Fold this protein.
Amino acid sequence: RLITGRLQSLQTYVTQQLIRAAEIRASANLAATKMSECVLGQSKRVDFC
Amino acid sequence: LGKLQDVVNQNAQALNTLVKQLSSNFGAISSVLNDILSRLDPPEAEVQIDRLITGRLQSLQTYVTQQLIRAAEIRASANLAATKMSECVLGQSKRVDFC
Amino acid sequence: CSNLLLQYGSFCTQLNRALTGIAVEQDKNTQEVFAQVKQIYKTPPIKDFGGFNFSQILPDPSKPSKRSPIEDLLFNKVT
Amino acid sequence: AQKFNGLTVLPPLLTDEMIAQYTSALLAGTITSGWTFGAGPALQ
Amino acid sequence: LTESNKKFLPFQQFGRDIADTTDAVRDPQTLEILDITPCSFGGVSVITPGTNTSNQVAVLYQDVNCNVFQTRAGCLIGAEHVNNSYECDIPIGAGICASYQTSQSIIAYTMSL
Amino acid sequence: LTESNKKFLPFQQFGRDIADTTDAVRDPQTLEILDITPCSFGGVSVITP
Amino acid sequence: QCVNLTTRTQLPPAYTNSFTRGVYYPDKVFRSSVLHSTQDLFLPFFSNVTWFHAIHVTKRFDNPVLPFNDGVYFASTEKSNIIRGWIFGTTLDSKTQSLLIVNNATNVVIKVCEFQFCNDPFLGVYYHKNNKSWMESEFRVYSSANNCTFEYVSQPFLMDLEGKQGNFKNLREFVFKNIDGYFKIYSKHTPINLVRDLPQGFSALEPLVDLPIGINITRFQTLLALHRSYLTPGDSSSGWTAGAAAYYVGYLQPRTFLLKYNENGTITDAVDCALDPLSETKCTLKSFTVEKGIYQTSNFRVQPTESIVRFPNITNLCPFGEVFNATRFASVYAWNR
Ligand SMILES: *[C@@H]1O[C@H](CO)[C@@H](O[C@@H]2O[C@H](CO)[C@@H](O)[C@H](O)[C@H]2NC(C)=O)[C@H](O)[C@H]1NC(C)=O
Ligand SMILES: *[C@@H]1O[C@H](CO)[C@@H](O[C@@H]2O[C@H](CO)[C@@H](O)[C@H](O)[C@H]2NC(C)=O)[C@H](O)[C@H]1NC(C)=O
Ligand SMILES: *[C@@H]1O[C@H](CO)[C@@H](O)[C@H](O)[C@H]1NC(C)=O
Ligand SMILES: *[C@@H]1O[C@H](CO)[C@@H](O)[C@H](O)[C@H]1NC(C)=O
Ligand SMILES: *[C@@H]1O[C@H](CO)[C@@H](O)[C@H](O)[C@H]1NC(C)=O
Ligand SMILES: *[C@@H]1O[C@H](CO)[C@@H](O)[C@H](O)[C@H]1NC(C)=O
Ligand SMILES: *[C@@H]1O[C@H](CO)[C@@H](O)[C@H](O)[C@H]1NC(C)=O
Ligand SMILES: *[C@@H]1O[C@H](CO)[C@@H](O)[C@H](O)[C@H]1NC(C)=O
Ligand SMILES: *[C@@H]1O[C@H](CO)[C@@H](O)[C@H](O)[C@H]1NC(C)=O
Ligand SMILES: *[C@@H]1O[C@H](CO)[C@@H](O)[C@H](O)[C@H]1NC(C)=O
Ligand SMILES: *[C@@H]1O[C@H](CO)[C@@H](O)[C@H](O)[C@H]1NC(C)=O
């Protein structure tokens, strides 16, 4: 009973850590695209920088 | 090509894990349901069958949640490929360090 | 097993819908990356482009496959 | 301060010193050379 | 049982922390405050030069504190630290990588930006 | 039980795979190696105009 | 019947090193191109193995009753076929079942009974004057037996009784195991041209027989054969010859091994997991090729050493005083409680 409760505990933490990785990867990709535009040159995209 | 080899190996390893997970007991006395049915009566072995039915269950959803998250970056990559197809291929993109 | 699965058939429907959902998301994913043009164009028979060699990316009719030699290379590189 | 049952914090490959050196290098590039450095060699 | 620097009120025998763990207990016979700390734990990481390149490996510890070089990212043994910096290929962490460089042995160094 | 083209060493009885599945058996009478394959499974799909 | 030997000058046993020896098939199934790991009793690589001598040129004859652990490894570089067989048992005094494995010149039999063994069972080979051949007559291995259960006869292996002093030309390995009362024998004849320091070659040992006995084995002894030519007087007291022979005895311990299988379903290489961190990396990845990068094999944890019990200073005491130092004591018929 103790093991089944604890393996139930660790799985939710893994899933919520995984979705946080998805959001931060999406944000980190947005930083790389912004800076390759706004910093590493001049971006013609209006309301982007 | 690292990306295609990595995702294919991840697909096979996760799918082979589900095969190897079916060979697990999940705290019971045997893995295969037929051996439990042949040795023990269904009225007595119902708790054994349920824990086996329980144990295989989370194996399915953990595979599903892993498969659902793997569809996310594949769609995220496919959207990135579609924009790069629309920009870098079907014309000249003014975006520096994008193509 | 199926008799006891009658109480868990609702979740199996959720997994089946999820497996169908990622499948219909996948064959759709090929549409917006490659199917951009509804017209299939062709190269002229005489390859005179001013000096630009295009035989490496153009498909070659010597082989039955429509893939480029670079395409057949990258096909053989990945398993 | 996480020293308990089965959790360890792994230090990152790049700490604060080198990432700050990265930003200084990019700032030095964008003031002295504009955008030529991000598309090739640095042009004064 | 290390020697602490925090005084306890003269009616308490136990003590907890923010994470709700008993890490401070008063010894009753001499009235000293002693802290409780887990001894050590971690993992055994290894660095490999690769196939058709070498045959020796090095043992890397995650956070266990100790040929033998005391790196910021734990303990690394079997790799000689060198002051010069090159471009690294095998990330270890905390601003130090490892590589197979000239016989020839496995070395550890701060990477070059 | 299909007719396999792979020979078995004269001390073995069964045969497994990466999944450790007994997809290969040896006949105990006249020494022929027969494979084991799942019979048939799938699903009924409906095309609707 | 048996006779006793006399005290003579012998040679102390020496210790040698094994080189990729003691690998057998752990199961009776077929695996093709499979890197499978199993838990079974093998001989560790580069492990330290007991070595005995049997060459006459002096008078070396050392066959002690070595203890039988969980699985043993027996390798012999036999050339002139001096080794005869093996016996097993617990006390060897006709109180428990005991094995008798003897490879005779006519047939091989496996009789497991309560045979009364002497202090050194052996076989005697005589050289006839009229016939130029070696023949075995002294069958002094036991006295009698009362009853037993199991008996078996193996194939009639042809044997040569002639002993020489030349270099070895054949190598024979034997593995004896006892799990679930089942006796397991693994053997394979591998020719080689060497006398000492066994090569680093690989040769898996195929199973030979699975004889069911179901008794206890904790001691074993080795049978040797000597020669009685015209040079020796013929008495087994101080003058005898035994040719040139050598045998190796090893002990098996449980270890985890990764076995490589080819398209033929034969074992080619074996990788350990508790010998080399490189070998641990190979067997955890389930592959024989390791690239460059970070790999995690296992964990490390420190165990506690002592157990201190600094109990409190508030330890109280029981009132054993006033009950003993009492001014008044009650009568026997009205005793206090
Ligand atoms: C374009 O490049 C290809 C390279 O693949 C050239 O093909 C080679 O031509 C040489 C010259 O005759 C041959 O020796 C090679 O065997 C050819 N290789 C292949 C793979 O076909 C081709 O000639 C080039 N075309 C132009 C117009 O420059
Ligand atoms: C009963 O009283 C006697 C006399 O005081 C006790 O004997 C003494 O016990 C203490 C205990 O530490 C010793 O230090 C003294 O040396 C003893 N004195 C003599 C003269 O023996 C005795 O212990 C008392 N009984 C009990 C059960 O405590
Ligand atoms: C504990 O008791 C002993 C006597 O048994 C005394 O010497 C010591 O000072 C005490 N320690 C305290 C009160 O902290
Ligand atoms: C590691 O241990 C040594 C001796 O035990 C000590 O001198 C050193 O300060 C320790 N390192 C850290 C980071 O605490
Ligand atoms: C590297 O060079 C510096 C130069 O001052 C020196 O102090 C240091 O000891 C050197 N490191 C090694 C490992 O030799
Ligand atoms: C078993 O016996 C049958 C009938 O005598 C024979 O056909 C078959 O070959 C035998 N199998 C063996 C000897 O392995
Ligand atoms: C084997 O053991 C002996 C004595 O116990 C020792 O001298 C020898 O070095 C050992 N061999 C190896 C390879 O360790
Ligand atoms: C060979 O030895 C075995 C072992 O007891 C015996 O049964 C057999 O009779 C012997 N052979 C001859 C020809 O005496
Ligand atoms: C005689 O044989 C029986 C088996 O039939 C066995 O149980 C018994 O132990 C044997 N006698 C002795 C003295 O061992
Ligand atoms: C065999 O030996 C083991 C250990 O000495 C003992 O537990 C067991 O009872 C024995 N069995 C027989 C049949 O002698
Ligand atoms: C083992 O398989 C190889 C692969 O072709 C083949 O060449 C070889 O003859 C086989 N060996 C045996 C004994 O069948």
In short: Chain C is about 50% helix and 0% strand. The pocket of 2-acetamido-2-deoxy-beta-D-glucopyranose (ligand 3) is lined by residues E 29-31; G 313 (CB under 6 Å). Chains C and G do not touch (no CB pair under 8 Å).
